[PDB]
Amino acid sequence: RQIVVGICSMAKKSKSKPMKEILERISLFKYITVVVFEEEVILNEPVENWPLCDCLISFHSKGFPLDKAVAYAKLRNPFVINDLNMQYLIQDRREVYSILQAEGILLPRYAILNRDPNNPKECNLIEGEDHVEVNGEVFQKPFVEKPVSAEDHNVYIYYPTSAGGGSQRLFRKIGSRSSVYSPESNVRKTGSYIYEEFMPTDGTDVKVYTVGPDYAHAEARKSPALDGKVERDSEGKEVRYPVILNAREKLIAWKVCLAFKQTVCGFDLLRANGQSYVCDVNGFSFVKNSMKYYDDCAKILGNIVMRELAPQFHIPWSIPLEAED
């Protein structure tokens, strides 16, 4: 019989153009059949009624019942491409940063301010005009303030008096905008946050997309905080610039992929002061315009499936060479 690769995610993702481009290529593997789990099934059917698969590609996004996916994987014991239990931790910036540190991955110097919403003034924060002290640790402006929820994209940057003060408020893109300037100079009064050193880049973010630990595609885009105007192309896509990862960065990608156990894993690098710092690890993420990425990604995923499952299915398999980017 065919090796079944099941795809289990919210329809917003499963039916996205990048996903459909990748799945059509995976389907070209002679011995692989792709089955995309319907959103109505994921949300409303007990996991005992979900389709069978031999290999499961499943990932959390807003509204996804991760508990069910974990229960399904437990029930059916498929080969799992992106580890499901780690996807709970990926939702928490504190957990993400803890893992990066444990792996010796460079990241911004940071401190966690946990607030008890019941008693919010009891927290370990002292604020001055050009700095904060979080658990006694001093962050001079510019510094960055991130909601502990990785799914909350309201990231604020605070400017020093020397640069005019105020703050830049970043958010999930709305049309042509990715951030706005605010005259507000004081930090947020409610919520729990990570405070971190601002890393000066050349005005671009590097977005990295792994497919297993030995492949990573990178591309750059204008830092959302710079002025907040999104650079769009004639097709309405964000303008993305060429990047080739150096040896250090290729190692970072290998570590991130393995440490988070996410074969397909997006993360962000800040190229600053002659090094590269990880500031965000997103897990399963979508490259949006590269035909070669779709080719490479589908081929690597198919080969991973074949290498793991062909012997069990009595299918001959010789593992081929794969590009590193």
Ligand X SMILES: Nc1ncnc2c1ncn2[C@@H]1O[C@H](COP(=O)(O)OP(=O)(O)O)[C@@H](O)[C@H]1O
Ligand Y SMILES: O=P(O)(O)O[C@H]1[C@@H](OP(=O)(O)O)[C@H](OP(=O)(O)O)[C@@H](OP(=O)(O)OP(=O)(O)O)[C@H](OP(=O)(O)O)[C@H]1OP(=O)(O)O
Binding residues: 12-13, 93, 146, 153, 172-173, 196-199, 205-207, 221, 223, 268, 280-282, 285-288
Least separation, in Å, of the C-beta of 270 and ligand X?
5
Residue with smaller CB distance to Mg ion, 177 or 248:
177
Round to whole Å and give the CA distance between 74 and 68: 10
Q: Which of residues 19-78 bind ligand Y (CB under 6 A)?
A: 61-62
Residue with smaller CB distance to ligand X, 33 or 61:
61
Q: Indicate the angle between helix axes 17-26 and 291-309, nearest 10 degrees.
A: 50
Q: Which of residues 20-79 bind ligand X (CB under 6 A)?
A: none
Residue nearest to ligand Y (CB): 286
Q: Indicate the angle between helix axes 247-259 and 93-102, nearest 10 degrees.
A: 120
For residue 238, the 8-state DSSP code is B
At residue 124, φ and ψ (nearest 5 deg) are: -85, 55
The interface partner of residue 227, options being ligand X, Mg ion, ligand Y, none and the CB cut-off 5 to 8 Å by kind, is: none
Beta-strand relationship, 79-80 and 55-58: parallel
Which residue of 158, 198, 209, 260 would you call a contact of ligand X, by CB under 6 A? 198
Residue with smaller CB distance to ligand Y, 54 or 219:
219
Least separation, in Å, of the C-beta of 4 and ligand Y?
24
- 288, two tokens: 């949006």
Q: Are the C-beta atoms of residues 35 and 23 closer than 8 Å to each other?
A: no
Residue nearest to Mg ion (CB): 280
Contact partners, residue 159, CB within 8 Å, separation at least 6: 141, 142, 165, 166, 167, 168, 185
Q: For the residues of 87-151, what is the DSSP string, one character each?
A: HHHHTBHHHHHHHHHHTT-----EEEE---SSSGGGSSEEE-SSEEEETTEEEESSEEEEESBTT
Which residue of 9, 201, 285, 303 would you call a contact of ligand Y, by CB under 6 A? 285
Binding residues for substrate: 12-13, 172-173, 207, 221, 285-288
Binding residues for ATP: 93, 146, 153, 172, 196-199, 205-207, 223, 268, 280-282
Round to whole Å and give the CA distance between 211 and 264: 5
The interface partner of residue 224, options being Mg ion, ligand X, ligand Y, none and the CB cut-off 5 to 8 Å by kind, is: ligand X
- Residue 282 touching ligand Y (CB under 6 A): yes
**Site residues (CB under 6 A) for ligand Y?**
61-62, 172-173, 207, 238, 266, 282, 285-286, 288
